[PDB]
Amino acid sequence: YEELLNRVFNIMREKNPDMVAGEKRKFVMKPPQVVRVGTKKTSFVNFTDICKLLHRQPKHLLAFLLAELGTSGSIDGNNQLVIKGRFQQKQIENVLRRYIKEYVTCHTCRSPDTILQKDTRLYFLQCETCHSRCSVAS
Amino acid sequence: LSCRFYQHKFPEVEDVVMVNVRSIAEMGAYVSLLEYNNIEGMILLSELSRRRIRSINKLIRIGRNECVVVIRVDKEKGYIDLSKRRVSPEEAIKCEDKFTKSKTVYSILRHVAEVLEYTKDEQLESLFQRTAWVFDDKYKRPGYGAYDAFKHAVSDPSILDSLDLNEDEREVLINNINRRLTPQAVKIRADIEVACYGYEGIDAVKEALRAGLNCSTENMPIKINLIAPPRYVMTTTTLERTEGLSVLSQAMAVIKEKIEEKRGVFNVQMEPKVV
Amino acid sequence: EVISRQATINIGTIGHVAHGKSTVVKAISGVHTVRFKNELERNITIKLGYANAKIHVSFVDCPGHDILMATMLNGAAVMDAALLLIAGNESCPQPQTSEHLAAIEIMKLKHILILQNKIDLVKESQAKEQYEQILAFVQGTVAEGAPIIPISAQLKYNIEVVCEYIVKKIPVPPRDFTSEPRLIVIRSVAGGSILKGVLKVGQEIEVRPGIVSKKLMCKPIFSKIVSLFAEHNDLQYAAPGGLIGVGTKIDPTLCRADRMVGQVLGAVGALPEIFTELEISYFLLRRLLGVRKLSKNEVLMVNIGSLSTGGRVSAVKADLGKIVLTNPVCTEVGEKIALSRRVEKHWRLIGWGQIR
RNA sequence: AGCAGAGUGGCGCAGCGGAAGCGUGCUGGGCCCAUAACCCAGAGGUCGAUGGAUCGAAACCAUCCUCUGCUACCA
């Protein structure tokens, strides 16, 4: 096996100063500075920042955000987005942790090169580091 | 010229007419009888709906067309009087159907009289009587029987040779009488699987295909299109449905019968249905 | 240049669920095994896979999921060989690798290769632990001899050495031509490998099981070959190994959704027996393999070709059972069988044997 | 390769051969001592690309693209 211990030390990708990334989930923790009127408004800010920075194009976060709790609301600009009802900061932040957790990042590779695709019938996702079939439906 | 839709001038009693509204006052609501030459009329404020009313803005709003039942007609004054409470929505559906059909007849007549450069307006009343109202008489009703008349007219010109028009009037009549009523292209379709088999089941299904491609009707072509080796849509392009569906099911029957010699079982997929 | 010929090998791909077995089989052959929409969305293998590449080689893509295991085992009985890919994810991959290895030991497929995939993704420490785990796990089973070569199938690094190593160590076996001719149908286009004899397009052929007619009984079905194919390519001849495509006379609507699947094919002239009851001399395993005394009237699963079928035990003894099946299975001659029983809603391999 | 809806004038359904039409929701008033109920008023202007008249084309009708919901079975 020590031929293959030498192999696992010598069949790696080309030795660059990056190293192992065990639980390298990206904490670029930017929850919205939600200003709530106290009755029926929340304003998502830093939304174009996520909506362009994270590799998930516009209108594709919208339906998933409106999916959780079924709350209505639509565009009012990406930044300063009006969503029906009152939410707390950590909860919608945690929903964004969930969004990263299962939809734009899978644990096969936690890397921010999970560019969007769509196959013949269902939304599929790959990863330019690995090009896997992360067909999300649930 | 804009005139009466039909031969008659004033509406008859207890009909249902589509009307549009002009004003709103205290003692009632003024209205524009669009279906008969835009003549004014009034609907009383009491004569609206038999419910505890709350918002007259909700029922009749300035600038929308609604169904009314004519109530009290008189001639020596012309005091047209309508209502809405004695109107059940089934009559409303028939009313909008009839008024829309009359708007199609009026639109095509406006088209032919305009493209004739027939500016002459009593002559447009003459043209209405010379073709439209007499065709209303020929099926003895305005609207649906008129639709029956033009239903022949765009297809068979024989009833259109029972007019009085000149050389050019038939030209503009055909020029606007055809290209506004027939987009049909009604193609009878039935996707089907014939699941016959046997020891020689290759030649059982190929004999079914032999029957399927030689029992083809001439003016109504029974074509065949394969996507999967047992799947094919039966397609006939004929405009009249009663011949097409009948000879589709007859052709399918003789195909299934001649391959009912060998063990013929049928995988049902679809039914004879036009577009 | 390389010769265009029928495939000489069928190579299985096994391992724990989501370990990357399917990507590796795709990497080797170049064809996508996933037929079903559900399989693509779920990211698991529902049906038995097939893919081809010249070397002519083929890959057999097995399901990682615990529930789907029985179909893979049935296909494995047809399979000439297999490759075990062992991912970076876990030292103990997930019970089924051992179970398939035990099935292989009963079947007598000793020539095994262990593939260490995804070395780039996992740590050196995991590799050392895996080495110790591999040494403990492989010992005392058929897998004990198997070599381990690290590679990344998806990335395509060290593939050339892998092809030479696999070619050298895991040779294609010949064929046993003398026995009555058999072609195996896995799906219903139908795929399989020609074990003996030969078939030609336009030749009359037979499906030995045939069909259970709507007591109801089954008469073997003799039919003709519309065409002859190897995977989705047409060839004049077929040998053992790989998935060859066998055309039949049956209407494809009847065959649709794997209705014919599990049957065996022979020439029309050939005489195969279609039997409700069979006698098998068997032995039983020490422990319950499926997790992470036999009595009469029980339903057991027998894998012949792609089929698995139940029957009832009228009487039970130490090594023999007689079963009456719900639909008939064709037994043309004596051969090899693996025995499984359904416990806790999943089929589990209890033992194996030969039909006398 | 089979069946429908779509190429938003303010959220949602598209109201049908004359442009938001309505249900809803939002923002704001009125009624009430208050609250609910109910009533009322409001929103930056080729609304896929192409043909044919038209007083007519987001909302005519045919065409090409994509989308969704639904196919089937083998690679």
mmCIF file with all atom_site columns, N, CA, C and O in Angstrom, chain B residues 233-260:
data_model
loop_
_atom_site.group_PDB
_atom_site.id
_atom_site.type_symbol
_atom_site.label_atom_id
_atom_site.label_alt_id
_atom_site.label_comp_id
_atom_site.label_asym_id
_atom_site.label_entity_id
_atom_site.label_seq_id
_atom_site.pdbx_PDB_ins_code
_atom_site.Cartn_x
_atom_site.Cartn_y
_atom_site.Cartn_z
_atom_site.occupancy
_atom_site.B_iso_or_equiv
_atom_site.pdbx_formal_charge
_atom_site.auth_seq_id
_atom_site.auth_comp_id
_atom_site.auth_asym_id
_atom_site.auth_atom_id
_atom_site.pdbx_PDB_model_num
ATOM 1   N N  . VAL B 1 233 ? -50.199 8.406   -34.603 1.00 0.00 ? 233 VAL B N  1
ATOM 2   C CA . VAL B 1 233 ? -51.394 9.236   -34.643 1.00 0.00 ? 233 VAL B CA 1
ATOM 3   C C  . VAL B 1 233 ? -52.127 9.080   -35.972 1.00 0.00 ? 233 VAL B C  1
ATOM 4   O O  . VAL B 1 233 ? -51.541 9.197   -37.055 1.00 0.00 ? 233 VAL B O  1
ATOM 5   N N  . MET B 1 234 ? -53.407 8.753   -35.886 1.00 0.00 ? 234 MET B N  1
ATOM 6   C CA . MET B 1 234 ? -54.291 8.791   -37.041 1.00 0.00 ? 234 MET B CA 1
ATOM 7   C C  . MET B 1 234 ? -54.683 10.245  -37.282 1.00 0.00 ? 234 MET B C  1
ATOM 8   O O  . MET B 1 234 ? -55.240 10.894  -36.390 1.00 0.00 ? 234 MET B O  1
ATOM 9   N N  . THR B 1 235 ? -54.389 10.763  -38.479 1.00 0.00 ? 235 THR B N  1
ATOM 10  C CA . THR B 1 235 ? -54.647 12.164  -38.789 1.00 0.00 ? 235 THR B CA 1
ATOM 11  C C  . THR B 1 235 ? -55.430 12.306  -40.082 1.00 0.00 ? 235 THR B C  1
ATOM 12  O O  . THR B 1 235 ? -55.037 11.753  -41.113 1.00 0.00 ? 235 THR B O  1
ATOM 13  N N  . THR B 1 236 ? -56.531 13.054  -40.021 1.00 0.00 ? 236 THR B N  1
ATOM 14  C CA . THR B 1 236 ? -57.290 13.450  -41.198 1.00 0.00 ? 236 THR B CA 1
ATOM 15  C C  . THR B 1 236 ? -57.493 14.956  -41.149 1.00 0.00 ? 236 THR B C  1
ATOM 16  O O  . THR B 1 236 ? -57.970 15.479  -40.140 1.00 0.00 ? 236 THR B O  1
ATOM 17  N N  . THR B 1 237 ? -57.254 15.630  -42.270 1.00 0.00 ? 237 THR B N  1
ATOM 18  C CA . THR B 1 237 ? -57.293 17.084  -42.334 1.00 0.00 ? 237 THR B CA 1
ATOM 19  C C  . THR B 1 237 ? -58.639 17.664  -42.793 1.00 0.00 ? 237 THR B C  1
ATOM 20  O O  . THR B 1 237 ? -58.717 18.870  -43.059 1.00 0.00 ? 237 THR B O  1
ATOM 21  N N  . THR B 1 238 ? -59.689 16.856  -42.921 1.00 0.00 ? 238 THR B N  1
ATOM 22  C CA . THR B 1 238 ? -60.914 17.350  -43.546 1.00 0.00 ? 238 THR B CA 1
ATOM 23  C C  . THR B 1 238 ? -61.662 18.378  -42.691 1.00 0.00 ? 238 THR B C  1
ATOM 24  O O  . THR B 1 238 ? -61.684 18.309  -41.461 1.00 0.00 ? 238 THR B O  1
ATOM 25  N N  . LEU B 1 239 ? -62.268 19.354  -43.378 1.00 0.00 ? 239 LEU B N  1
ATOM 26  C CA . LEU B 1 239 ? -62.920 20.490  -42.736 1.00 0.00 ? 239 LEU B CA 1
ATOM 27  C C  . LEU B 1 239 ? -64.253 20.086  -42.125 1.00 0.00 ? 239 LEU B C  1
ATOM 28  O O  . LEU B 1 239 ? -64.633 20.604  -41.072 1.00 0.00 ? 239 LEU B O  1
ATOM 29  N N  . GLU B 1 240 ? -64.996 19.197  -42.782 1.00 0.00 ? 240 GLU B N  1
ATOM 30  C CA . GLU B 1 240 ? -66.267 18.746  -42.239 1.00 0.00 ? 240 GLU B CA 1
ATOM 31  C C  . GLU B 1 240 ? -65.988 17.570  -41.308 1.00 0.00 ? 240 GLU B C  1
ATOM 32  O O  . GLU B 1 240 ? -65.294 16.618  -41.675 1.00 0.00 ? 240 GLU B O  1
ATOM 33  N N  . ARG B 1 241 ? -66.500 17.656  -40.085 1.00 0.00 ? 241 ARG B N  1
ATOM 34  C CA . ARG B 1 241 ? -66.118 16.650  -39.106 1.00 0.00 ? 241 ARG B CA 1
ATOM 35  C C  . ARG B 1 241 ? -66.899 15.350  -39.240 1.00 0.00 ? 241 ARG B C  1
ATOM 36  O O  . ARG B 1 241 ? -66.341 14.274  -38.978 1.00 0.00 ? 241 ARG B O  1
ATOM 37  N N  . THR B 1 242 ? -68.146 15.417  -39.717 1.00 0.00 ? 242 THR B N  1
ATOM 38  C CA . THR B 1 242 ? -69.040 14.267  -39.653 1.00 0.00 ? 242 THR B CA 1
ATOM 39  C C  . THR B 1 242 ? -68.616 13.165  -40.614 1.00 0.00 ? 242 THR B C  1
ATOM 40  O O  . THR B 1 242 ? -68.876 11.984  -40.353 1.00 0.00 ? 242 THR B O  1
ATOM 41  N N  . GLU B 1 243 ? -67.903 13.517  -41.677 1.00 0.00 ? 243 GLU B N  1
ATOM 42  C CA . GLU B 1 243 ? -67.362 12.504  -42.566 1.00 0.00 ? 243 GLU B CA 1
ATOM 43  C C  . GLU B 1 243 ? -66.032 11.992  -42.039 1.00 0.00 ? 243 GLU B C  1
ATOM 44  O O  . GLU B 1 243 ? -65.756 10.787  -42.101 1.00 0.00 ? 243 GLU B O  1
ATOM 45  N N  . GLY B 1 244 ? -65.232 12.904  -41.475 1.00 0.00 ? 244 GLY B N  1
ATOM 46  C CA . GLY B 1 244 ? -63.877 12.567  -41.063 1.00 0.00 ? 244 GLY B CA 1
ATOM 47  C C  . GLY B 1 244 ? -63.838 11.579  -39.918 1.00 0.00 ? 244 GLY B C  1
ATOM 48  O O  . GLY B 1 244 ? -63.136 10.564  -39.994 1.00 0.00 ? 244 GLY B O  1
ATOM 49  N N  . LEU B 1 245 ? -64.592 11.861  -38.845 1.00 0.00 ? 245 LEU B N  1
ATOM 50  C CA . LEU B 1 245 ? -64.569 10.991  -37.670 1.00 0.00 ? 245 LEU B CA 1
ATOM 51  C C  . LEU B 1 245 ? -65.149 9.619   -38.009 1.00 0.00 ? 245 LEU B C  1
ATOM 52  O O  . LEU B 1 245 ? -64.661 8.581   -37.531 1.00 0.00 ? 245 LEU B O  1
ATOM 53  N N  . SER B 1 246 ? -66.178 9.613   -38.862 1.00 0.00 ? 246 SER B N  1
ATOM 54  C CA . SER B 1 246 ? -66.851 8.383   -39.248 1.00 0.00 ? 246 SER B CA 1
ATOM 55  C C  . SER B 1 246 ? -65.926 7.487   -40.060 1.00 0.00 ? 246 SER B C  1
ATOM 56  O O  . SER B 1 246 ? -65.797 6.292   -39.765 1.00 0.00 ? 246 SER B O  1
ATOM 57  N N  . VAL B 1 247 ? -65.209 8.054   -41.035 1.00 0.00 ? 247 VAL B N  1
ATOM 58  C CA . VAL B 1 247 ? -64.333 7.188   -41.819 1.00 0.00 ? 247 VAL B CA 1
ATOM 59  C C  . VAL B 1 247 ? -63.028 6.884   -41.100 1.00 0.00 ? 247 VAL B C  1
ATOM 60  O O  . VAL B 1 247 ? -62.397 5.865   -41.410 1.00 0.00 ? 247 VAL B O  1
ATOM 61  N N  . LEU B 1 248 ? -62.663 7.669   -40.076 1.00 0.00 ? 248 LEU B N  1
ATOM 62  C CA . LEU B 1 248 ? -61.550 7.293   -39.210 1.00 0.00 ? 248 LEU B CA 1
ATOM 63  C C  . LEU B 1 248 ? -61.879 6.049   -38.408 1.00 0.00 ? 248 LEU B C  1
ATOM 64  O O  . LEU B 1 248 ? -61.088 5.099   -38.359 1.00 0.00 ? 248 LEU B O  1
ATOM 65  N N  . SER B 1 249 ? -63.050 6.044   -37.771 1.00 0.00 ? 249 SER B N  1
ATOM 66  C CA . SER B 1 249 ? -63.418 4.884   -36.978 1.00 0.00 ? 249 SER B CA 1
ATOM 67  C C  . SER B 1 249 ? -63.735 3.671   -37.846 1.00 0.00 ? 249 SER B C  1
ATOM 68  O O  . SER B 1 249 ? -63.440 2.540   -37.443 1.00 0.00 ? 249 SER B O  1
ATOM 69  N N  . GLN B 1 250 ? -64.257 3.887   -39.060 1.00 0.00 ? 250 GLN B N  1
ATOM 70  C CA . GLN B 1 250 ? -64.476 2.784   -40.000 1.00 0.00 ? 250 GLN B CA 1
ATOM 71  C C  . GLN B 1 250 ? -63.163 2.178   -40.509 1.00 0.00 ? 250 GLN B C  1
ATOM 72  O O  . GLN B 1 250 ? -63.035 0.944   -40.596 1.00 0.00 ? 250 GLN B O  1
ATOM 73  N N  . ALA B 1 251 ? -62.177 3.026   -40.845 1.00 0.00 ? 251 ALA B N  1
ATOM 74  C CA . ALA B 1 251 ? -60.862 2.536   -41.243 1.00 0.00 ? 251 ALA B CA 1
ATOM 75  C C  . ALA B 1 251 ? -60.163 1.801   -40.109 1.00 0.00 ? 251 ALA B C  1
ATOM 76  O O  . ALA B 1 251 ? -59.569 0.738   -40.325 1.00 0.00 ? 251 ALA B O  1
ATOM 77  N N  . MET B 1 252 ? -60.249 2.341   -38.887 1.00 0.00 ? 252 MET B N  1
ATOM 78  C CA . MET B 1 252 ? -59.672 1.671   -37.722 1.00 0.00 ? 252 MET B CA 1
ATOM 79  C C  . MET B 1 252 ? -60.351 0.321   -37.491 1.00 0.00 ? 252 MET B C  1
ATOM 80  O O  . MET B 1 252 ? -59.687 -0.666  -37.145 1.00 0.00 ? 252 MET B O  1
ATOM 81  N N  . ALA B 1 253 ? -61.674 0.265   -37.692 1.00 0.00 ? 253 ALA B N  1
ATOM 82  C CA . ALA B 1 253 ? -62.429 -0.970  -37.506 1.00 0.00 ? 253 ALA B CA 1
ATOM 83  C C  . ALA B 1 253 ? -62.005 -2.043  -38.502 1.00 0.00 ? 253 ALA B C  1
ATOM 84  O O  . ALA B 1 253 ? -61.847 -3.206  -38.124 1.00 0.00 ? 253 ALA B O  1
ATOM 85  N N  . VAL B 1 254 ? -61.855 -1.682  -39.788 1.00 0.00 ? 254 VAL B N  1
ATOM 86  C CA . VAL B 1 254 ? -61.493 -2.701  -40.784 1.00 0.00 ? 254 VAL B CA 1
ATOM 87  C C  . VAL B 1 254 ? -60.045 -3.145  -40.566 1.00 0.00 ? 254 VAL B C  1
ATOM 88  O O  . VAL B 1 254 ? -59.705 -4.319  -40.797 1.00 0.00 ? 254 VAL B O  1
ATOM 89  N N  . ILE B 1 255 ? -59.185 -2.238  -40.078 1.00 0.00 ? 255 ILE B N  1
ATOM 90  C CA . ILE B 1 255 ? -57.813 -2.610  -39.735 1.00 0.00 ? 255 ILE B CA 1
ATOM 91  C C  . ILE B 1 255 ? -57.829 -3.619  -38.593 1.00 0.00 ? 255 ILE B C  1
ATOM 92  O O  . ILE B 1 255 ? -57.180 -4.667  -38.658 1.00 0.00 ? 255 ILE B O  1
ATOM 93  N N  . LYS B 1 256 ? -58.599 -3.327  -37.540 1.00 0.00 ? 256 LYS B N  1
ATOM 94  C CA . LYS B 1 256 ? -58.651 -4.229  -36.397 1.00 0.00 ? 256 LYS B CA 1
ATOM 95  C C  . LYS B 1 256 ? -59.349 -5.545  -36.712 1.00 0.00 ? 256 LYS B C  1
ATOM 96  O O  . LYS B 1 256 ? -58.966 -6.580  -36.163 1.00 0.00 ? 256 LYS B O  1
ATOM 97  N N  . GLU B 1 257 ? -60.289 -5.548  -37.660 1.00 0.00 ? 257 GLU B N  1
ATOM 98  C CA . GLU B 1 257 ? -61.002 -6.761  -38.060 1.00 0.00 ? 257 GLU B CA 1
ATOM 99  C C  . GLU B 1 257 ? -60.161 -7.691  -38.920 1.00 0.00 ? 257 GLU B C  1
ATOM 100 O O  . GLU B 1 257 ? -60.191 -8.907  -38.716 1.00 0.00 ? 257 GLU B O  1
ATOM 101 N N  . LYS B 1 258 ? -59.434 -7.158  -39.903 1.00 0.00 ? 258 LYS B N  1
ATOM 102 C CA . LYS B 1 258 ? -58.620 -8.038  -40.732 1.00 0.00 ? 258 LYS B CA 1
ATOM 103 C C  . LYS B 1 258 ? -57.433 -8.573  -39.947 1.00 0.00 ? 258 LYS B C  1
ATOM 104 O O  . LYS B 1 258 ? -56.917 -9.646  -40.274 1.00 0.00 ? 258 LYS B O  1
ATOM 105 N N  . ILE B 1 259 ? -57.017 -7.871  -38.899 1.00 0.00 ? 259 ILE B N  1
ATOM 106 C CA . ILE B 1 259 ? -56.046 -8.408  -37.966 1.00 0.00 ? 259 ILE B CA 1
ATOM 107 C C  . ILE B 1 259 ? -56.758 -8.906  -36.698 1.00 0.00 ? 259 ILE B C  1
ATOM 108 O O  . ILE B 1 259 ? -56.156 -8.998  -35.629 1.00 0.00 ? 259 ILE B O  1
ATOM 109 N N  . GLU B 1 260 ? -58.060 -9.192  -36.798 1.00 0.00 ? 260 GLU B N  1
ATOM 110 C CA . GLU B 1 260 ? -58.753 -9.992  -35.797 1.00 0.00 ? 260 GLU B CA 1
ATOM 111 C C  . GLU B 1 260 ? -58.853 -11.446 -36.234 1.00 0.00 ? 260 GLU B C  1
ATOM 112 O O  . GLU B 1 260 ? -59.405 -12.275 -35.506 1.00 0.00 ? 260 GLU B O  1
#
